[PDB]
Ligand binder design. Sequence first.
Ligand code: Q99
Ligand code: Q99
Ligand code: CL
Lengths: 306, 302
Amino acid sequence: SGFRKMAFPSGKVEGCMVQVTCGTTTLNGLWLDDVVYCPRHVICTSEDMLNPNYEDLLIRKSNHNFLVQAGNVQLRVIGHSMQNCVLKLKVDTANPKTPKYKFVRIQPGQTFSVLACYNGSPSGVYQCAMRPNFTIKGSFLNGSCGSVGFNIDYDCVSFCYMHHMELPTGVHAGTDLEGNFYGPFVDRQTAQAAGTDTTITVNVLAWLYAAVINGDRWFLNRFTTTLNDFNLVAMKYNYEPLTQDHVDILGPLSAQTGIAVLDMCASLKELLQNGMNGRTILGSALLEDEFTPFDVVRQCSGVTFQ
Amino acid sequence: SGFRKMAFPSGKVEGCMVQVTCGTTTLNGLWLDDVVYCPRHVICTSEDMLNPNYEDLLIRKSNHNFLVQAGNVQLRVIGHSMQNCVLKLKVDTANPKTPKYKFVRIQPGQTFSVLACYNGSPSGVYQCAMRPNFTIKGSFLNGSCGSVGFNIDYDCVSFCYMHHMELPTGVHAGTDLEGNFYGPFVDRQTAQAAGTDTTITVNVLAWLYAAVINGDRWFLNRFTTTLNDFNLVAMKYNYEPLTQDHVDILGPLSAQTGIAVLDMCASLKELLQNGMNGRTILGSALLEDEFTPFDVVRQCSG
Ligand SMILES: O=C1C[C@H](Oc2cc(Cl)cc(OCCNC(=O)c3cc(=O)[nH]c4ccccc34)c2)N1
Ligand SMILES: O=C1C[C@H](Oc2cc(Cl)cc(OCCNC(=O)c3cc(=O)[nH]c4ccccc34)c2)N1
Ligand SMILES: [Cl-]
């Protein structure tokens, strides 16, 4: 029993975190095989950041301008290149702790664990979702750039996020490990704003199933809805549209609890129109949208990652 | 910026998790140096769980009755002893992944990370607080016994909890790593109930300071209160009494934000009276009590 915001065990990723210094700037790097990946903005001064020409800034750097520290050991940079917004530093040593890994680009609504790092040292792990506006509501301070997000699928780490910046509203933006930003953001010190956010509907439904699995049933009702009627109501409350793919993905949870997806949609519609009436669901007075249907199944069934 | 429920990175603890089997029972063990620690109830059968005599059950076991598996390798048990409710299995190999560690007994209101495990394999990490009724609101299934709670301030792992059981209400009970239960619980299947739970007042105040540090000020007010009048109100909402130790502990956060502790107490009194009126504080519509003053400083300042 119980339902917590749970992150993947971070050990496989911790053994990849290094510190990258270029001049006065220090941030985190991810050391996999013989390459250290980090935000390309590590090469920028504060004035360069206003309108950077990264190709021009990079051509001026030599390998010795990058100091990479793995624990108390300095790694030797023997090459450097850029791929989109990520700098790739070739080092003379393959990381002996490199886990089985892939780089994956995730979609909004997908969740991942973030290993927040400072000076190449892991400080915390938390679970978050890629918001529909492509930001993450992370928790990051100065020096956190280069911290990564990941999932574990079987024994393979899938790296999906690298931290680059914090927007004026305190939300965060970053790239996949191929250096492509999530969202309409750029790596320049300029006024940038995230679009209006929406709630991840399929995730709220998954969390309602988690509540039912844990014995929280007060919000269940006798009613059902059509997908089209539910989507009209979802648009009204700034909820993401629920697709037939989402309905199929919730199938296993629907079969386990005996509550059809459109039956749970009718519970959600009533919750939006009327509120919780002083009640809570899984210790929350708001509808939680940072658990995917896979997260719910994984947590309610005890899947492990040795 | 931002404020999240954040756990410690679990790598140091993952490299210590092993599977312990005794007869038909399998659970998790913590392998540090040449000792594997686990709940002593691993030696019980289904017939023994209401009134086990652990000394009597243990004397009947040989080293070869304990199977310890670390990854795909079997460890050799060369000794066994009990310390309170924890079984200590001496093994023939020191764990090469043993981090710098200590065993600490925590007090209610304290927070820690839990590495939930099944069959000696880590499945997830989450943040918990030791409730005032000495339970934790974890997320554990069958086979989770022996999963541990810990903190990692600096490079030293402080193990503070070992999971033993789930109570009928779905909350969890366990021991420190010296085998002493937190609370009035025993490792017997007899009906046990946790006392009425209360909100950890000092932690709610710390989280209100975290909200102010992150730019949220809507809940502040021009009032202050005496400590005694605050406690008289807070108790009516099932909040733990706020002591002068708690007021002193909040001193650094009070100095950083410019909001005196009793001034923040008056904000808390108003929130308990009015609710949030459609507003949120740090993305929550309820008052959060699983962040300590130390957690807030660590997360906000680094
Ligand atoms: O709207 C916007 C943001 C963009 O400006 C940029 C662009 C780029 Cl590519 C990088 C950047 O800052 C990099 C250095 N940031 C940090 O260390 C940092 C990260 C964090 O998540 N939180 C912080 C909290 C306080 C202070 C520092 C941080 C800033 N324009
Ligand atoms: O009120 C109470 C509890 C005490 O009964 C005990 C005492 C002892 Cl020492 C052990 C025990 O169970 C050990 C085996 N528990 C589990 O695997 C288990 C742990 C968990 O946290 N959640 C579960 C969810 C479902 C099913 C199994 C679990 C039970 N009397
Ligand atoms: Cl403590």
